[PDB]
Amino acid sequence: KKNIKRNVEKIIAQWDERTRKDFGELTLSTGLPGIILMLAELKNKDNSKIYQKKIDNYIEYIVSKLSTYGLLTGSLYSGAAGIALSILHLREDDEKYKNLLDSLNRYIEYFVREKIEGFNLENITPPDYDVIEGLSGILSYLLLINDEQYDDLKILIINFLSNLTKENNGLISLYIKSENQMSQSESEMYPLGCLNMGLAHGLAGVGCILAYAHIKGYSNEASLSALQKIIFIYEKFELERKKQFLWKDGLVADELKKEKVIREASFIRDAWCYGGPGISLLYLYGGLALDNDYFVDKAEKILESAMQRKLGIDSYMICHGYSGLIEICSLFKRLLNTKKFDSYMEEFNVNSEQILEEYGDESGTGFLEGISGCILVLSKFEYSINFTYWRQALLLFDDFLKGG
Ligand SMILES: [Zn+2]
């Protein structure tokens, strides 16, 4: 289909215009890091020449924005880790990429080490630890670096996350007080606060990165116990019978302190960020890292269930849309050689032309919610060799069974 080409071309036009006119532009979420990945993934196509040029332009632009306004964050989705991920594949092509990457890496270590030092536990909020803004996301990038000089950093973060699964105010740790919720409306959903149970912002994300850390060579008894405790909490608060393979977004103090779910949710959905699809990654990675066939078998059922149901799905975006679910299924097939999701993947690719044309102008061009995320997904069905590490940003680990 020649429609990816037209669409890409118009994304380049918008970004060529912007790159001679905002914090947002430098983020993986909505900005150039995402556009760089999308374009870099299209190398086999005829216009890779032009694409590498735009990529190099957009990198130029990024470094002069950094060397003027600096960086405030090391985060995967808003900061240095996402900028570094978007160009990691380019490292050995020229020293300009290597130098820039080394700068990003020193900044990250500085930033992480500084964030851990100043951390106040009874002010814990998801951007502290999570995938989008916190350490889990940062570690996801760092584990791609083999240079042994980041070992202490890796374990510093691993211990820190593990420690957050310990009991506190009686029992607690990763529990978020109501005033510590990310948004006004969330403070109001959870007047007594909660344990966030999503991949993007909650316990599943922390669990995944610890399983992935283990298989990359980075674990101890404390982290393996943390992983275990997390999967144990997922096994415990799983909803029942007809709501089987479902979890609420958050568990509240008393639910936790009585070990049974009490009040029922208003809105559960099937997303990468919250719900079954994301949660299946925890079971998959726990299962594989812990050598537990039950966990692995179950991850499959959790995802299979979500694909059948598509709860709250009304777009093709990555974060909480159908492209997200589809990409998680593609990972299962890569790691397990399962055929369980083959019809869902087939159907999506059959429908591709329509997906792009009806994609809103409304959610922008960016990775996490915009059309370029969707183009990444489509592009790797068409040509499955990944030139980039984009999937790392979603905790989709193609190297999970490659060793250390
Ligand atoms: Zn989302």
Task: Compute the distance from residue 275 Cα to the ligand 1 centre, in Å.
Answer: 10
317 CA from centroid of ligand 1 (Å): 9
| Tokens encoding 99 | 């130098």
How far does the centroid of ligand 1 lie from the alpha carbon of residue 324, in Å?
9
DSSP-derived letter for residue 403 is -
Instruction: Please tell me the distance between residue 273's alpha carbon and the centre of ligand 1 in angstroms.
Output: 5
User: How would DSSP label each residue in 20-89?
Assistant: T--GGGGSTTTSHHHHHHHHHTTTTSTTHHHHHHHHHHHHHHHHHHHHHH--S---TTTSHHHHHHHHGG
Token pair 């909505």: residue: 30
Nominal resolution in Å? 2.5
| Method used to determine the 3D structure | X-ray
Listed in sequence order, the residues at least 6 apart from 263 whose beta carbon sits closer than 8 Å to its beta carbon are 252, 255
Q: Compute, in angstroms, the gap from residue 256 CA to the centroid of ligand 1.
A: 25
Asked if 396 and 323 touch (Cβ cutoff 8 Å), the reply is no
φ and ψ at residue 376, rounded to 5 degrees: -55, -50
Which of 159, 244, 249, 168 has the alpha carbon at shortest distance from 204? 249
In 291-388, alpha helices (H): 293-309, 322-336, 342-350, 352-357, 371-382
CB 234 within 8 A of CB 228: no
Alpha carbon distances (Å) from 283 to 70, 235, 275, 324: 39, 10, 13, 17
Residue 403 alpha carbon to ligand 1 centre in Å: 31
User: What torsion, rounded to 10 degrees, do the Cα atoms 165, 166, 169, 174 define?
Assistant: -10
Domains of the chain: 1-404 (1.50.10.20)
Tell me how far apart the alpha carbons of residues 102 and 84 are, in angstroms, rounded to a whole number: 9
**CA 152/CA 218 separation, integer angstroms:** 10
Q: In 3-state terms, the chain is what percent helix, strand and coil (to 5)?
A: 60, 0, 40
| CA 294 to ligand 1 centroid distance, Å | 28
Q: How many helices (H) and strands (E) does the chain have?
A: 17, 2
The CA–CA distances, whole Å, from 126 to 49, 182, 236, 248, 401 equal 41, 7, 22, 16, 29
Q: Burial code of 122-152, b = ≥16 C-beta within 10 A, e = fewer?
A: eebbbbbbbbbbbbbbbbbbbbebeeeebee
Instruction: Provide long-range contacts, Cβ within 8 A and 24+ apart, for 133-136.
Output: 133/73, 133/75, 133/76, 133/77, 133/78, 133/79, 134/75, 135/160, 135/161, 136/161, 136/205, 136/206, 136/208, 136/209
Long-range contacts formed by 340-344: CB under 8 A, 24+ apart: 340/300, 340/304, 341/303, 341/304, 341/307, 344/307
